[PDB]
């Protein structure tokens, strides 16, 4: 899969993810949701090799949902990211590694703080105010570096995200058929249906 | 008594009681007769029904085109041992393009049964087999006991009241051995032999099971109206 | 009372299956003796061929483990040969791995450690044998090391094993109490064998023909067993003084 962006603002995390699924010559789908809800206040967007992406995302989802039931408790975004990193770090020295890059956007209900974690397929984890995977960062980061403030509202975050998507639509050779945008806050996960 | 708890224990007189108890299961089983000439070998088996609604338990199993046996005792054990014979007959044909000698088939059954009598956890086979076959040395009849003892005979019988049929064959020995190139007369001698082991009941059309293998005769089982000719 | 059937502790803190294995040791009714010279270690053992149908050359309780190590066994021949084959395998493997000949006392300890395992593990029975290992070790010199079903082993100046071990032991004890040395002060192994046979005759109070004895001799860099004619020469020398 292609472009996955993330931006952590004042009180929420916003994950933008392309809708295009291309198999070589033809664009098979233009409405693909490249994200899974791991827990009520933790969302994970993913991009990488065909099949491995969904297989990994669903496997993590199943494990976090199992923990949630066993302990009757939601793991902190930090705890979920640490679990995901270990699975990818384990994966890279396997017979056939998961070729999957993920952004984990979560709202920590204990600390009342949004948290964005960027983890590549090697198991390289970093906590960031804004992150991306593949070539998405090359086009967008120069805009985010300029405009980003830690005290930004969700609406300002979406406006800065639109400027990022516009720059991608201008200078990227590939048509990624726009993005599905999702917000993670204290009230949980909701999808922006107009973008 | 104290030495019949498992197959791994000798008695003070050097007996294996679990093997002797397995041998007893054969005596409870329905009578089956084996006899051969120089050209043909015949199995005759009295099949046993549960009641009048039930079918008559099949006694004869085909192992190859040139070999097969009849059983007396635990039928599931006969299925295990016959399946093993089928495989060994098959292995010989595929690997060596060679029909498995009846004598060698006996040696293989003996060795398979023996392992169950010397090892803890396992149990002896609870069935006796009469193996007939025609190979490169003519017609053959074998008697298999789950003790491991396999014996090559002209004729024999195993099961309940088998002694009656075994005495008859011991008298008729000189006659039935000479029935060469006459399958019908050899079966007649086998049907007359198993008749010496009957009490109260007689040989009906769904009661009697006959098999024959010979010089130009593949191992074929006769049941139903096919054996009405011999009643 | 299943504490008498397998190797677990009785209320007294005893292993009865070990104690009964010691009793199996004397089933052959054979007495062995081992003594040390200056340059050699000699082991003698009674040879009894009761059946005339037996090939007497094949009746032996002395084993050539390695070139350097010899082993006499007190106990039944099946367990003796079980122990013999293992000792040979252990001695060969040692040389391959560590690049020098397995010492007598190290093999004794190894076979004793194996014997110990049988006294602790239930599925394995003890071997009903006492193993007397002899060599001229390249470091320690003349060496006698004896193993038993308990897994006990120790070095000896001299030793005796069998039904009449005590009579032989006391006879040897009395000699070493006089001489006040840990060995037979003799140059040739031939005379150390003559000493061994003489002191067994004195202890048991029985005379021996060439076919009644079995002799093993350890020298530097080889252990070997004497033929009936080599023993006969030994018996002649004893009788002529």
């Amino acid at each position: 899969m292609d472009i996955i962006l993330g931006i952590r603002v004042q009180d929420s995390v916003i994950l933008a993810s392309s809708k295009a699924v291309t198999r070589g010559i033809s664009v098979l789908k233009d409405s693909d949701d490249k994200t899974r809800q791991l827990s009520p206040h933790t969302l994970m967007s993913f991009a990488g090799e065909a099949g491995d992406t969904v297989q990994f995302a669903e496997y993590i989802q199943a494990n976090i949902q199992l923990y949630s039931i066993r302990e009757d408790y939601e793991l902190s975004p930090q705890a979920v990211s640490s679990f995901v990193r270990q699975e990818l770090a384990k994966s890279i020295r396997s017979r056939r590694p998961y070729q999957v890059n993920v952004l984990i956007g979560g709202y920590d209900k204990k600390k009342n703080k949004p948290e964005l974690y960027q983890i590549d397929y090697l198991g390289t984890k970093v906590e960031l105010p804004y992150g991306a995977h593949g070539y998405s960062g090359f086009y967008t980061f120069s805009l985010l570096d300029h405009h980003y403030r830690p005290d930004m509202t969700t609406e300002e975050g979406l406006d800065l995200l639109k400027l990022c998507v516009q720059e991608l639509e201008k200078r990227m050779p590939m048509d990624f058929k726009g993005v599905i945008v999702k917000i993670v806050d204290k009230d949980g996960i909701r999808q922006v249906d107009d973008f | 008594n104290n030495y019949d708890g498992d197959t791994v224990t000798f008695s003070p007189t050097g007996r294996l009681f679990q093997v002797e108890y397995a041998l007893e299961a054969i005596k409870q089983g329905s009578v089956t007769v084996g006899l051969r000439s120089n050209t043909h070998a015949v199995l005759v088996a009295l099949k046993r029904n549960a009641d009048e609604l039930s079918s008559y338990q099949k006694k004869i199993i085909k192992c190859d085109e040139h070999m097969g046996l009849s059983l007396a005792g635990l039928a599931p054990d006969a299925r295990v041992l016959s399946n093993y014979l089928r495989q060994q007959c098959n292995y010989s044909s595929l690997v060596f393009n060679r029909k498995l000698a009846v004598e060698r088939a006996g040696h293989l059954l003996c060795d398979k049964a023996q392992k169950n009598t010397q090892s803890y956890g396992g149990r002896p086979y609870g069935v006796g087999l009469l193996i007939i076959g025609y190979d490169k040395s003519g017609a053959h009849l074998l008697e298999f006991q789950p003790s491991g003892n396999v014996t090559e005979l002209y004729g024999t019988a195993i099961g309940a009241r088998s002694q009656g049929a075994k005495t008859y064959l011991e008298r008729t020995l000189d006659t039935f051995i000479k029935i060469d190139g006459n399958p019908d007369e050899l079966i007649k001698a086998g049907v007359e032999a198993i008749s010496q082991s009957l009490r109260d009941e007689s040989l009906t059309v769904d009661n009697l099971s006959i098999a024959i293998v010979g010089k130009d005769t593949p191992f074929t089982i006769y049941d139903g109206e096919a054996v009405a000719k011999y009643i | 009372g299943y504490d008498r059937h397998i190797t677990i502790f009785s209320p007294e803190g005893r292993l009865y299956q070990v104690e009964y294995a010691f009793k199996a040791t004397n089933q052959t009714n054979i007495n062995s003796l081992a003594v040390r010279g200056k340059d050699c270690t000699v082991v003698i053992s009674q040879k009894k061929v009761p059946d005339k149908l037996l090939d007497p050359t094949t009746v032996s309780y002395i084993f050539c483990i390695s070139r350097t190590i010899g082993m006499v066994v007190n106990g039944p021949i099946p367990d003796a040969r079980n122990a013999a084959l293992r000792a040979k395998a252990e001695a060969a493997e040692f040389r391959y791995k560590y690049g020098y000949d397995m010492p007598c006392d190290v093999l004794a300890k190894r076979m004793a450690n194996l014997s110990q395992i049988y006294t602790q593990r239930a599925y394995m029975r003890p071997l009903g044998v006492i193993l007397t290992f002899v060599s001229v070790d390249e470091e320690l010199g003349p060496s006698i090391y004896k193993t038993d079903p308990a897994g006990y082993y120790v070095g000896y100046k001299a030793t005796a094993t069998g039904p009449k071990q005590q009579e032989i032991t006391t006879n040897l004890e009395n000699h070493f109490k006089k001489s006040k040395i840990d060995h037979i002060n003799e140059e040739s192994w031939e005379k150390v064998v003559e000493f061994a046979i003489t002191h067994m005759i004195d202890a048991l109070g029985t005379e021996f023909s060439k076919n009644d004895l079995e002799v093993g001799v350890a020298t530097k860099d080889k252990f070997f067993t004497l033929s009936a004619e080599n023993i006969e020469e030994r018996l002649v020398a004893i009788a002529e003084q």
Binding site: - | Y21, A25, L53, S55, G73, G126 | -
Partner: protein, 235 residues
């Protein structure tokens, strides 16, 4: 103690003979094979009136052309049914055809004596395997924990078996209709059942070539029970 695979002095496997005693304590199951189809009927025997009786599943589909009724420790049957279903589907995958009722029964009976010190004990349940194939037509088999299977024109297993089997002895003939068989199973179940037979404590099923294996609705069985009562009052 003593081996699980031990023979008695009479030449019988103790554990197999003891499992047969457990099957005698089981609820009654009856099968009747006709030229129009095979009928399978069971006593449900609910331990309490609060137990929803339609959740008692003692008649089970193996394939479209093979049904199965059980009596004894019914929990033990689940792994036997699973194997039977797998065997039936697996053969269809390998040979693009339905499996012979005898071949299916033989496959189930191969599990029976796979116990020792494999599973730790024999199965504590007997099965009536009823079906149809092109070769041998409508068939009813009795699969025991001994690994032996007999083909029957009619068979009763469970607590009321010997009383029911004596009744089946008199009643069965080679010219029975499917409707006659249905009433006959209902008649003999009602005879041997402790509680009074209705559509909630008893269940009917059949296997026909056309429609395959079908478990009867409580409404359909209720009508056949009412048809039985009237024809018994008729003389």
């Amino acid at each position: 103690d003593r081996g699980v695979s031990t023979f008695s002095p009479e030449g019988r496997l103790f554990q197999v003979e003891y499992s047969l005693e457990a099957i005698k304590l089981g609820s009654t199951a009856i099968g009747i094979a006709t030229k129009e189809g095979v009928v399978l009927g069971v006593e449900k025997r609910a331990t309490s009136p609060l137990l929803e009786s339609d959740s008692i599943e003692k008649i089970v589909e193996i394939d479209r052309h093979i049904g199965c009724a059980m009596s004894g420790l019914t929990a033990d049957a689940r792994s036997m049914i699973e194997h039977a279903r797998t065997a039936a589907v697996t053969h269809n995958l390998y040979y693009d055809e339905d499996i012979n009722v005898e071949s299916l029964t033989q496959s189930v009976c191969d599990l029976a004596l796979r116990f020792g010190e494999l599973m730790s004990r024999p199965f504590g349940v007997a099965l009536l395997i009823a079906g149809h194939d092109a070769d041998d037509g409508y068939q009813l088999f009795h699969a025991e924990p001994s690994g032996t299977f007999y083909r029957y024109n009619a068979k009763a297993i469970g607590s009321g078996s010997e009383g029911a089997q004596a009744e089946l002895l008199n009643e069965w003939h080679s010219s029975l209709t499917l409707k006659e068989a249905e009433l006959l199973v209902l008649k003999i179940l009602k005879q041997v059942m402790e509680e009074k037979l209705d559509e909630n404590n008893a269940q009917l099923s059949c296997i026909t070539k056309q429609d395959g294996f079908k478990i009867y609705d409580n409404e359909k069985t209720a009508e056949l029970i009412k048809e039985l009562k009237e024809k018994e009052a008729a003389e």
